[PDB]
Design a protein around this ligand. Structure first.
Ligand SMILES: Nc1ncnc2c1ncn2[C@@H]1O[C@H](COP(=O)(O)OP(=O)(O)OP(=O)(O)O)[C@@H](O)[C@H]1O
Ligand SMILES: Nc1ncnc2c1ncn2[C@@H]1O[C@H](COP(=O)(O)OP(=O)(O)O)[C@@H](O)[C@H]1O
Ligand SMILES: [Mg+2]
Ligand SMILES: [Mg+2]
Length: 1397
């Protein structure tokens, strides 16, 4: 009944005034709301009962609408509470506020449906609705001036006046800007820069404020992952402010706006400063809203111990009112927290997208003398993209936590002083004792985290250069030596990881033990000294919850201080890399007087080279090894540092460079032959037909579209060089720089690539060809022969200019191809990985881990179940004598948990890298050939980085959070068992989100992985072929190709971020509902039944614990499920094969001098590479004398290298005997066989280190035998002219020297062994003819008694052999003396030596 039912004839009657009545204004302020409702719901019926742009004042109108909803929800509560004093139900108290609550939601729904459709004239209803109701609240505010500031409804209607007037001022802030009524200029603003037309599906900035906090736009994206899975071009593009190009520009303006390692920090606080400020303000607001939970736990438990308006003191002294106020505080704190998290993470993603483009822009100007001679490697650069940029991004996720922790500590100490008293100071300085100690171990971490990222980096050198040369380590039996070399660095890294793990264990122990020591010294330091300071369950379970909420930042301070040390050395390495070295009449190039140098401080490698290159004519650069050929090619491009002289051109213009070491993309065969050029089919066919690449293309599995490169099918040695040559013949570049292309090709391919190609594709089409070559038989075909000697050019000009003026190098050319009886002239033309993590820990450590974390939280509950038996006894010192022995059992059961977590996380990571390193070495070469090296290196680089450094923290956070959430649901179901009835229809709802989330999580997790991999692959392939890219002038195109990758990675990271925040805000809303339920069923159980009021505070404290640690349990469970995939991949690699190193023969029967007379008898041998392939050799029979010098010649693909590898059992021999010295070769251990036979591969496989290390990694032979085995490799004068002499530094891959001196260094490496069987698999390929003719005469005199099997590149060097093998497609075609083979004149050997004269 309205206006009461007591029948006093005073509220129904209006005599002295119809407006002066105490009632009837409650009857008057409803018809504005029913006016709005009954004219708004027709518009919802006729308009919406069947490229969006926000109106201005959007965030202010939504914030004022939420404040209006909160004040109306308080006014309904004031009406219901003020009715309870009366005898009956006075309807005029709760109905006029309830109708306004029903109409305000309708008003904000109406405003959103108007703004999303751009119907601004339809706001005229909202023009008037915020006037008259405001007017109807104004009279109700001024007729209440009879009751001021001591009655609650006075302040409530004053707030209603202020909110309605503010909404009216925002409403008139729409007509005056987007004019719809009473104006002549309808200033229609544009849609948001057409960001809905470009195909952006992110929609997070272009959403209303309710969908920005609850991520409601994401709720449609989870529902459509169940039907069709999420792919790229379904998450759309990026918005115009989150692109890497526009995030890179604001990084550059910050760098230019200030003209070191602090310049980046001032450049990151200027570009991305206000966004971190905004996220820190969201974190601060969530902190201040978190400091209203314990105030409600104070007020509720303080209530349980003890004119129709209700005073404002007796409103905040109610219990259900404080419960719903705590619920509405948690509901807004939990969304301010996610609003902080999203802004911080999107700022980190924009930072990553900016600094990756800055690193690439440094790469495109990077001098290659940094990579080659000295400082950095390619793996170091791809590490500072993959690891260092990710660490700097992960710092930006926690920088608002670092900025908003001390304000939480300060407000907690002030509120603790207000609640408990000066005894809070007893619990304050102890927390202040946590301030330098968490700094102190920080300094210790700044040692250890600066050491591990040193040592592991060196390990990622020594692993990688092992794997990329693993075949040579499996051919010299050096694999155990290199495995011990990596194990030493791994041991020195595990020492630093122990020193880091001990200090982060004591940091975790400090962060978890300083709160409980504070609780102990505060609660016993209260009842001992100040026994009259009002000890009560209210103040006890308020200050205990404040101590708990001062331990929620300490849940993350250890991870914050762990992550801010890895991001200072990150920006230190980034500043070290960004300020490194950089580059700056019918003739193409006309160098004159130019001294060029590789090292900036040293002798110039080229000296006074005054050359000229004719246009459209083939010019040849010939000379010895180390003579300046590739350096002269790289001085015209500008890669070498110019000291003096001039370099003219035609700016340069693009050339077609094909380097001495071929460089392949991670793309198909077609896509790195055309190389970002227009595809012309006829020119492509003429290119691959002149290169004779078509029969090698047909054997490939997909033909023209098979993914070759590093992360794909491993090609041969000549196929990749022919592809890299074929790239250069497809450019219209008009000047071709063909560095030595005949290294891996044989005679029949080289004579076809020289006739068609260099003489027919580039001499018909008048393109300048500059051909570095060692094949002097093509010296007739040149128009300008350049001849170098020790860097300086010796002579240039035609063959007439060389036979008339030089006449000594000319005769030296003529006696090199034995053409003395001729003339040189120009031609007139859970999972199992979790058990693997738990079985590699050991049962003694695992039972000490499980049964000491269930024992800590069974103690921590008894620490909080006591003080509920104590403070109920406060309404006597034996309660405090057993509280110290429980608080000391929460420290000594904390230290053991924090040490066994890190002990487990270290003992697993030691056991999981040694067991992987010992198994990768034992794997057969077929495993290294098929599977890409990028995967095997990523299991050593990233997964062995997340196992030791991320899982022992994630496991600790997961175990602590899930045990707090389990032990917190077991005591709010003990004090209120009715909560169990309310647990079942909600907790399974948690399951019914998580399953419903997971098919959109595990989908979107696989776009943050399969889009980061091409980004890292592009960063790896832009460094290996940097000189090739900068010579084609494809720097801008490759920068655009970077931007198109990092944008697609950034959008896939942003969608995963938004999905995570969607799930987390839903889980925290369920947690807030848990707090509301467990507060209501504790209050209503203590007011009716007798819950003794301490159990109510206990249940309230642990309900707040559920709200805090439900989301951390969910997040750490998802993070453990993500990080266990690394253990799964390592366990996948750990179950690989073995090469069967044991032999069928006991080592007592193999003599000490095993191949004492190399007497290799081969009978019916046939090899294969894998059991599904054709036999490479077939029925080969050969008998070799104990001192013969057999040579092997044949075409490419005949099986020459398979014959060479058949002695070392690197090919699957399935039929046939190889018997040496009467002892079979299959019944032999592999480390006995391979360490007593030598082989020189065609490719140089030099490792980084020193000359003495590369010649022998064991340091077993003397120093003088490293010189006799260097004098015969034609390198004594080169090594003796080095600064170090011996022990001079060879850098990674051997790039410090040439590709001729590299092959000479591998030849000298094989000559230090005193074995009696030698195999030379085309060793003299990169070496010139003069040095080869010297080297053969020194080798076949010093090794005058050793059996040498020489796979001959140029078959004119093999005529001095005793016997000659001619392979032709498998089986041996000819096997006789070379004179008897040449006497036939129709034999294949006489055919082979005919094409080389
Ligand atoms: N990338 C490099 N960084 C530093 N020094 C180099 C590099 N390349 C070569 N050198 C030095 O410069 C000298 C000239 O080598 P160059 O670059 O001319 O190779 P090259 O002689 O053309 O190769 P080849 O022996 O196949 O002809 C060598 O003695 C070597 O020590
Ligand atoms: N690692 C490998 N895996 C599979 N097949 C191979 C491998 N190496 C060589 N082959 C095959 O063996 C044949 C001859 O190989 P090889 O002896 O290396 O060539 P060449 O005699 O020209 O040096 C080739 O046709 C090639 O297809
Ligand atoms: Mg060279
Ligand atoms: Mg070969």
């Amino acid at each position: 009944a309205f206006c009461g039912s007591e029948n006093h004839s005073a509220a129904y009657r209006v005599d002295q005034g119809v407006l002066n009545n105490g009632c009837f204004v409650d009857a008057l302020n409803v018809v504005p709301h029913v006016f709005l409702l009954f004219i708004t719901f027709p518009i919802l019926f006729i308009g919406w009962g069947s490229t969006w742009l926000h109106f201005p004042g959007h965030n202010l109108r939504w914030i004022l609408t939420f404040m209006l909803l909160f004040v109306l929800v308080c006014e309904i509560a004031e009406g219901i509470l003020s009715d309870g004093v009366t005898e009956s139900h006075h309807l005029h108290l709760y109905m006029p506020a309830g109708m306004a609550f029903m109409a305000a939601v309708t008003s904000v729904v109406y405003y959103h449906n108007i703004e999303t459709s751009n119907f601004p004239k339809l706001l005229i209803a909202l023009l008037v609705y915020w006037t008259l109701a405001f007017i109807t609240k104004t009279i109700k505010f001024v007729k209440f001036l009879d009751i001021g500031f001591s009655q609650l409804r006075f302040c409530l209607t004053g707030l209603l006046v202020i909110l309605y007037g503010m909404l009216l001022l925002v409403e008139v802030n729409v007509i005056r800007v987007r004019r719809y009524i009473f104006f002549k200029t309808p200033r229609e603003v544009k849609p948001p820069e057409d960001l809905q037309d470009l195909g952006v599906r992110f929609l997070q900035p272009f959403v209303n404020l309710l969908s920005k906090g609850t991520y409601w736009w994401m709720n449609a994206f989870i529902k459509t992952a169940h039907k069709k899975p999420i792919d790229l071009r379904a998450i759309g593009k990026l918005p115009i402010a989150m692109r890497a190009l526009t995030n890179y520009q604001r990084l550059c303006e910050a760098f230019d706006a200030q003209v070191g390692a602090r310049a980046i920090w001032q450049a990151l606080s200027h570009a991305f400063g206000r966004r971190l400020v905004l996220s820190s303000t969201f974190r601060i607001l969530a902190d201040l809203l978190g400091f209203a939970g314990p105030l409600c736990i104070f007020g509720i438990v303080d209530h349980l111990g003890k004119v129709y308006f209700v005073s404002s003191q007796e409103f905040l002294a109610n219990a259900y009112v404080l419960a719903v106020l705590l619920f509405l505080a948690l509901l807004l704190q939990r969304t301010f927290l996610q609003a902080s998290y999203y802004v911080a993470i999107e700022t980190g993603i924009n930072l990553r997208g900016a600094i990756q483009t800055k690193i690439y822009n440094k790469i495109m100007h990077l001098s290659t003398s940094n990579l080659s001679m000295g400082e950095m490697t390619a793996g170091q650069i791809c590490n500072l993209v993959a690891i260092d940029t990710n660490q700097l991004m992960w710092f930006f996720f926690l920088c608002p936590n670092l900025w908003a922790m001390p304000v939480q500590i300060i407000v907690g100490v002030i509120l603790l002083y207000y609640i408990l008293g000066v005894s809070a100071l007893i619990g304050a300085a102890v927390i202040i004792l946590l301030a330098p100690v968490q700094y102190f171990v920080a300094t210790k971490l700044s040692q250890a985290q600066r050491s591990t990222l040193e040592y592991s980096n060196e390990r990622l050198k020594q692993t990688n250069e092992m794997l990329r040369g693993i075949k040579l380590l499996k051919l010299y039996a050096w694999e155990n030596i290199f495995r011990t070399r990596v194990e030493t660095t791994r041991r020195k890294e595990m020492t630093s990881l122990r020193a880091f793990a001990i200090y982060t264990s004591i940091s975790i122990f400090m962060n978890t033990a300083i709160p409980i020591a504070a609780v102990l010294i505060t609660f016993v330091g209260h009842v001992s000294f100040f026994k009259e300071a009002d000890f009560s369950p209210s103040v006890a379970f308020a200050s205990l919850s404040l101590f708990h909420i001062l331990v929620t930042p300490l849940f993350l301070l250890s991870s914050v201080v762990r992550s801010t040390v890895k991001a200072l050395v990150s920006v230190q390495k980034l500043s070290e890399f960004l300020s490194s070295a950089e580059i700056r009449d019918n003739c193409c190039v006309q160098i004159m007087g130019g001294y060029f140098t590789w090292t900036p401080d040293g002798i110039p490698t080229l000296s006074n080279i005054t050359i000229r290159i004719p246009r459209g004519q083939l010019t040849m650069i010939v000379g010895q090894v180390g003579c300046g050929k590739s350096s002269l090619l790289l001085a015209a491009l500008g890669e070498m540092q110019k000291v003096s002289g001039a370099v003219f051109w035609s700016k340069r213009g693009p050339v077609a460079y094909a380097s001495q070491k071929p460089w392949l993309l991670n793309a198909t065969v077609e896509e790195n032959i055309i190389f970002e050029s227009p595809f012309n089919k006829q020119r492509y066919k003429m290119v691959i037909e002149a290169c004779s690449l078509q029969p090698d293309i047909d054997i490939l599995p997909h033909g023209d579209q098979t993914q070759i490169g590093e992360r794909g099918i491993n090609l041969s040695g000549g196929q990749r060089q022919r592809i890299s040559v074929a790239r250069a013949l497809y450019q219209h570049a008009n000047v071709v720089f063909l560095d030595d292309p005949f290294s891996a090709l044989d005679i029949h391919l080289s004579d076809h690539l020289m006739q068609a190609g260099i003489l027919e594709l580039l001499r018909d089409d008048k393109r300048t060809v500059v051909l570095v070559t060692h094949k002097l038989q093509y010296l007739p075909h040149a128009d300008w022969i350049i001849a170098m000697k020790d860097g300086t050019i010796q002579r240039e000009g035609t063959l007439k200019d060389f036979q008339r003026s030089e006449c000594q190098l000319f005769e030296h050319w003529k006696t090199l191809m034995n053409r003395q009886d001729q003339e040189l002239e120009k031609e007139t033309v859970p999972w199992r990985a979790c058990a693997k993590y738990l079985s590699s820990a050991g049962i003694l450590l695992l039972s000490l881990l499980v049964f000491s974390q269930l024992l800590k939280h069974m103690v921590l509950v008894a620490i909080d179940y006591w003080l509920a038996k104590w403070t109920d006894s406060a309404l006597q010192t034996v309660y405090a004598m057993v509280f110290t022995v429980l608080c000391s059992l929460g420290i000594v059961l904390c230290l053991v948990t924090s040490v066994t977590v890190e002990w487990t996380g270290l003992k697993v990571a030691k056991r999981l890298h040694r067991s992987l390193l010992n198994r990768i070495i034992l794997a057969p070469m077929r495993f290294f050939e098929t599977t890409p090296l990028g995967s095997i290196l990523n299991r050593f680089s990233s997964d062995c980085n997340t196992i030791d450094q991320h899982i022992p923290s994630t496991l600790e956070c997961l175990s602590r959070s899930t045990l707090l959430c389990v032990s917190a649901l077991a005591v709010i179901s003990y004090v209120t068992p009715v909560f169990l009835v309310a647990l079942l229809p909600l907790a399974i709802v948690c399951y019914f989100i998580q399953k419903y989330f997971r098919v959109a999580s595990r989908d979107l997790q696989q776009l943050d992985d399969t889009t980061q991999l091409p980004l890292l692959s592009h960063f790896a392939e832009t460094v290996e072929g940097l000189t090739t890219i900068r010579a084609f002038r494809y720097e801008a195109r490759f920068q655009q190709k970077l931007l198109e990758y990092t944008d697609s990675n950034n959008i896939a990271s942003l969608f995963l971020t938004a999905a995570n925040r969607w799930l987390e805000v839903r889980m925290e809303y369920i947690g807030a509902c848990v707090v509301l339920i467990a507060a209501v069923t504790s209050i209503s159980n203590s007011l009716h039944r007798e819950l003794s009021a301490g159990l109510v505070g206990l249940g309230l404290t642990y309900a707040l614990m559920v709200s805090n640690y439900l989301n951390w349990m969910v997040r750490n469970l998802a993070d453990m499920e993500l990080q266990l995939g690394a253990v799964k991949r390592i366990h996948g690699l750990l179950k690989t094969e073995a090469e069967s190193y044991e032999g069928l023969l006991a080592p007592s029967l193999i003599p000490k001098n095993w191949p004492d007379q190399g007497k290799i008898q081969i009978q019916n041998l046939s090899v294969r590479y894998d059991s599904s392939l054709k036999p490479v050799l077939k029925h080969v029979n050969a008998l070799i004398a104990p001192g013969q010098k057999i040579g092997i010649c044949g075409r490419t693909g005949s099986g020459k290298s398979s014959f060479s590898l058949a002695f070392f059992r690197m090919v699957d021999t399935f039929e046939g005997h190889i018997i040496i010295d009467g002892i079979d070769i299959a019944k032999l251990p592999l480390h006995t066989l391979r360490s007593r036979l030598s082989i020189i591969l065609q490719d140089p496989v030099l490792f980084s280190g020193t000359i003495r290390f590369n010649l022998d990694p064991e340091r077993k032979c003397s120093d003088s035998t490293l010189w006799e085995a260097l004098e015969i490799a034609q390198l004594k004068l080169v090594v003796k002219a080095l600064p170090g002499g011996l022990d001079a530094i060879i850098t990674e891959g051997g790039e410090n020297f040439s590709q001729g001196q590299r092959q000479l260094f591998c030849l000298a490496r094989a000559f230090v062994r005193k074995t009696s069987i030698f195999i030379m698999d085309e060793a003299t390929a990169s070496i010139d003819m003069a040095t080869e003719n010297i080297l053969q005469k020194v080798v076949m005199t010093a090794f005058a008694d050793r059996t040498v099997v020489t796979i001959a590149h140029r078959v004119h060097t093999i005529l001095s052999a005793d016997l000659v093998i001619v392979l032709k497609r498998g089986a041996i075609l000819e096997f006789d003396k070379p004179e008897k083979l040449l006497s036939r004149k129709d034999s294949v050997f006489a055919s082979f030596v005919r094409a080389d004269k």
